[PDB]
Write an enzyme that holds these catalytic residues in place. Sequence first.
Site, PDB file in Angstrom:
ATOM      1  N   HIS A 135       0.799  -1.217   0.000  1.00  0.00           N
ATOM      2  CA  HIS A 135       0.000   0.000   0.000  1.00  0.00           C
ATOM      3  C   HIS A 135       0.840   1.279   0.000  1.00  0.00           C
ATOM      4  O   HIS A 135       0.312   2.355  -0.260  1.00  0.00           O
ATOM      5  CB  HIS A 135      -0.989   0.019   1.180  1.00  0.00           C
ATOM      6  CG  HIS A 135      -0.386   0.456   2.477  1.00  0.00           C
ATOM      7  ND1 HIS A 135       0.114  -0.431   3.403  1.00  0.00           N
ATOM      8  CD2 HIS A 135      -0.206   1.692   3.001  1.00  0.00           C
ATOM      9  CE1 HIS A 135       0.575   0.238   4.444  1.00  0.00           C
ATOM     10  NE2 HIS A 135       0.395   1.528   4.228  1.00  0.00           N
ATOM     11  N   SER A 145       4.678   2.674   8.172  1.00  0.00           N
ATOM     12  CA  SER A 145       4.506   1.362   7.541  1.00  0.00           C
ATOM     13  C   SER A 145       5.830   0.845   6.999  1.00  0.00           C
ATOM     14  O   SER A 145       6.576   1.591   6.369  1.00  0.00           O
ATOM     15  CB  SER A 145       3.513   1.440   6.383  1.00  0.00           C
ATOM     16  OG  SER A 145       2.186   1.354   6.858  1.00  0.00           O
ATOM     17  N   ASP A 152      -0.088  -7.697   1.876  1.00  0.00           N
ATOM     18  CA  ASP A 152       0.226  -6.292   1.638  1.00  0.00           C
ATOM     19  C   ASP A 152       1.743  -6.067   1.650  1.00  0.00           C
ATOM     20  O   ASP A 152       2.227  -5.029   2.108  1.00  0.00           O
ATOM     21  CB  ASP A 152      -0.461  -5.420   2.696  1.00  0.00           C
ATOM     22  CG  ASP A 152      -0.208  -3.929   2.488  1.00  0.00           C
ATOM     23  OD1 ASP A 152       0.165  -3.528   1.357  1.00  0.00           O
ATOM     24  OD2 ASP A 152      -0.393  -3.163   3.464  1.00  0.00           O
TER      25      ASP A 152
END
Lengths: 157, 157, 153
Positions: B34, B108, B56
């Site tokens: 993402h 992230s 992901d």
Amino acid sequence: VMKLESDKTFPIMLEGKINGYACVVGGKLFRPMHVEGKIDNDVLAALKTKKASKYDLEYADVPQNMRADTFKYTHEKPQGYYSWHHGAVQYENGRFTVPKGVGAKGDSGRPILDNQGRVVAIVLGGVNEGSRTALSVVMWNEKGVTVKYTPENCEQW
Amino acid sequence: VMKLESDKTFPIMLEGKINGYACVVGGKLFRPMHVEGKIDNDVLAALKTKKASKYDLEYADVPQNMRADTFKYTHEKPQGYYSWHHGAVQYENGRFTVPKGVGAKGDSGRPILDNQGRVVAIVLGGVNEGSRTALSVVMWNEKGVTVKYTPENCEQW
Amino acid sequence: ESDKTFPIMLEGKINGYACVVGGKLFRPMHVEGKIDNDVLAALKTKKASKYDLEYADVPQNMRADTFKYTHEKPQGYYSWHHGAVQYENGRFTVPKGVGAKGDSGRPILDNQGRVVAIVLGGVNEGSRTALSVVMWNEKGVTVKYTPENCEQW
């Protein structure tokens, strides 16, 4: 004020023989990883060492009282000459070289210095290439990044 | 300024800001799917990545000259505490939590490590649940199988 | 005052000497044995291999009671435990038949009782014997001078 520079390199003993050397540079103590033996210095020999296989180097922080008695180091490697225990050391096109017949197993860990007494590299080994012997060394660029360079068919010392 | 340890996490840039991070674990580079932008390291930024939507996560083998200098990982996750860039990370009842106010967009891809320096997880996002904030991550189990956990109402960072 | 140089005992004999100069303890590196003084004998030394010396910073409550040294070596006469010493051409010399094993560590002083050099060895050259020493220049820099075929004492 008497400024007497003390030894900053120490022989590593193994089977009662000098198998290499360690030295203190920038508050740290270093010894080639491939070299076995006990540093001929109680205090230093007891220090625990972190290992960096990539650079064939083990290192530890030197005691507070020694922090000020270590080699200063630099990345500045202009082409020309430098010195190490056995004499003249040449630096050209990214390689350090010494005279043929100088350097052999036992010299691993010896520092190379500029005329200002600053460490430019640490020897790990070498190999004869005609009239000169090319060295394997650990050096540093302007950012402080450690770089290891090993000549073709190099021999660990 | 001597740097003996190589970086293992690299920021991913987007319009001048850090949008996330990539990190090297087990000889592979990992990056949250993402997260968009360019890895701030030319060699890593050019590697062709394999995608796995389910987790992901995007990844690619690291060039051999770096294979050795990447994080070590494990499946061991005994309840207790771990660490990451922002501090203490708790692990209990199968989920990681950090104090409130810590963790936001840009985090992230950062790894969570145990005291032995091994990677136990990679952050994909989180959500505040009061005094604590729960994390979304990809972990590893016995078989080395990648497992992803996402708290209720999680939001990608 | 008066005791600023001490004998280095080995197997009961004096293998050489140690002395305190400028807040520092000095002792020849090639000389083995224990300094004849618990206080100095107890200090941990650092090696100064290039100068064939081993030294340690003496405590503070002693820095004032140690030899005072100088770089000033004007051609002329000097002294040491065995008598006259001559300095000429950057070299210290003693009469022939003087100086031998056990003298390493002895200091040479000027007319003012200041140390100007520490003896490391010597080599006979006819009627005069040339000494290998450790001294200082006009910059506080420690220097080591060693004549050819110089035997350590």
